[PDB]
């Protein structure tokens, strides 16, 4: 939702890390017409993590949106911005003709053309020298055989989908050393007590009767274990409340049988548990 957008030949490079990536704002800002992902499914972005996320923003035409993909050929996908074949990420683009256009012709957006060599993936060339196209070059002044490499976009109102300005944002995901620290939100739920609920406080998978505890911990301690290395107490990461992890219920049921030689009526015995935690006499 930024106001000033970078050109396609000088696309923006913002390192995003050490934060929670709430991707709902992406779906809330625009109808995401050109939303297409290549490494992760368009819905599992909140269920995994990455080390660093790079957001590349630029403005192109509506037909040039198809050039933002791993392996392409075109004016932008050869000389302006190229994605590697191993691109694992999403491509977001939407119409922006309402702000990036003017009646006299918007000239702040240009695209490079006629480069002598294809740019490597994720490359940015800031130089803007003349394009020498002859063994009798100019004396530095642009003209014959020294044509300008940057051509201005034809951004104007009343244009069609083929030429209207479209703002594109490329979210590249990276994995390397220094393990992942920027993940999506996990949507924590409300706390349930006095029930045999499964708990996952900061990854502590288990099951037990979460009851209020009086064993005050230290400010820097989050879990608690007994002699048997079994976790029996955990703090809710939302507050300073401490809960004891007691074993919910387990015990061998013994069936009292007087013997089929006499009768068929039998009884059961739930060893080590109350009668209030089991499904006449």
């Amino acid at each position, epitope marked *: 939702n930024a106001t000033t957008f970078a050109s396609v030949y000088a696309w923006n490079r913002k390192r995003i890390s050490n934060c929670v990536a709430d991707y709902s704002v992406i779906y809330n800002f*625009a*109808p995401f*017409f050109a939303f297409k992902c290549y490494g992760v499914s368009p819905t599992k972005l909140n269920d995994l993590c990455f080390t660093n996320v790079y957001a590349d923003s630029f403005v192109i035409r509506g037909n040039e949106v198809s050039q933002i993909a791993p392996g392409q050929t075109g004016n932008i996908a050869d000389y302006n911005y190229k994605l590697p074949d191993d691109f694992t990420g999403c491509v977001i683009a*939407w*119409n922006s*003709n*309402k702000l990036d*256009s003017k*009646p*006299s012709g918007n000239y702040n957006y240009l695209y490079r053309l006629l480069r002598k060599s294809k740019l490597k993936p994720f490359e940015r060339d800031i130089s803007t020298e003349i394009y020498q196209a002859g063994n009798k070059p100019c004396n530095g002044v642009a003209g014959p055989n020294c044509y300008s490499p940057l051509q201005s976009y034809g951004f*104007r*109102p*009343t*244009y*069609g*989908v*083929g*030429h209207q300005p479209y703002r594109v944002v490329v979210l590249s995901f990276e994995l390397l050393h220094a393990p992942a620290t920027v993940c999506g939100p996990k949507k924590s739920t409300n706390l349930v007590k006095n029930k045999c609920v499964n708990f996952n406080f900061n990854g502590l998978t288990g099951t037990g009767v979460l009851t209020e505890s009086n064993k005050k911990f230290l400010p820097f301690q989050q879990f608690g274990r007994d002699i048997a290395d079994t976790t029996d107490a955990v703090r809710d990461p939302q507050t300073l409340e401490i809960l004891d992890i007691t074993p919910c219920s387990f015990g061998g049921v013994s069936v009292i049988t007087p013997g089929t030689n006499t009768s068929n009526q039998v009884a059961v015995l739930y060893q080590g548990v109350n009668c209030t935690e089991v499904p006449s006499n």
Partner: antibody, heavy 123, light 112 residues
């Protein structure tokens, strides 16, 4: 072929607001290379243009009818609704929904048109 | 600032040639796709001109566009007027600031 379904009342009280709807039948409203516009036909006058709306919703409204006319597309039900306030004897005209081509060239060639709802206003 | 002007009605003898101009007295006209439409009483208007120099496929080939008088005043040249050509016409253009401007009512009739 593709047709344009219309719905909405044609009799309202003056100094009020009216919202008319129009649904594209036989196709899909989310198809590209086309806009979606509403068109007014004043009685005794010529043809009047209200505004067109892309699938992104750039809100190209009429300058003389600013803050008085508004249309919003809703691709979830393949329909778009026109709304306006202060309806009175000033216009009491008929409105038509239609689509227009933007396939490379400039916006032109209205190929599909609506039926039209006579918006009569009386106190 | 783009404005148009349309005459009330134009009529001539059958098989003659008439000229109806949109009169772009304000703003540039040649920089946009000039359009002409056709409407019958009751029904919605239909397209009779799709391009500045090309006609749509759904209309008989009897229309020709006069885009400019070398300064201004775009026009439409219709050759071979007959009884089926009697209908209403409307100029359609756009401003450079995305302001669409319809010319207005233009009724063509034949003096039978």
């Amino acid at each position: 072929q593709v047709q344009l379904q219309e719905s909405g009342p044609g009799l309202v009280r003056p100094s009020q607001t009216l919202s008319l709807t129009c649904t594209v039948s036989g196709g899909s409203v989310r198809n590209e290379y086309y806009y979606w516009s509403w068109i007014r036909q004043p009685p005794g006058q010529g043809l009047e243009w209200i505004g067109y709306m892309h699938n992104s919703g750039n809100t190209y409204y009429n300058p003389s009818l600013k803050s008085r006319v508004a249309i919003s597309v809703d691709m979830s039900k393949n329909q778009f609704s026109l709304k306006l306030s202060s309806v009175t004897v000033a216009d009491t005209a008929v409105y038509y929904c239609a689509r227009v081509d933007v396939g490379g060239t400039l916006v032109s060639t209205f190929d599909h048109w609506g039926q039209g709802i006579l918006v009569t206003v009386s106190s | 600032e783009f404005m148009l002007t349309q005459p009330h009605s134009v009529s001539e003898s059958p098989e003659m040639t008439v000229t109806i101009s949109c009169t772009g007295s304000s703003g540039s006209i040649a920089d946009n796709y000039v359009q002409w439409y056709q409407q019958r009483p009751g029904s919605a208007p239909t397209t009779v001109i799709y391009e500045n120099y090309q006609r749509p496929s759904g209309v008989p080939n009897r229309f020709s566009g006069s885009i400019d008088s070398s300064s201004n005043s775009a026009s439409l040249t219709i050759s071979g007027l007959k009884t089926e050509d009697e209908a209403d016409y409307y100029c359609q253009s756009y401003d450079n600031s995305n302001v669409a401007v319809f010319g207005g009512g233009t009724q063509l009739t034949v003096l039978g």
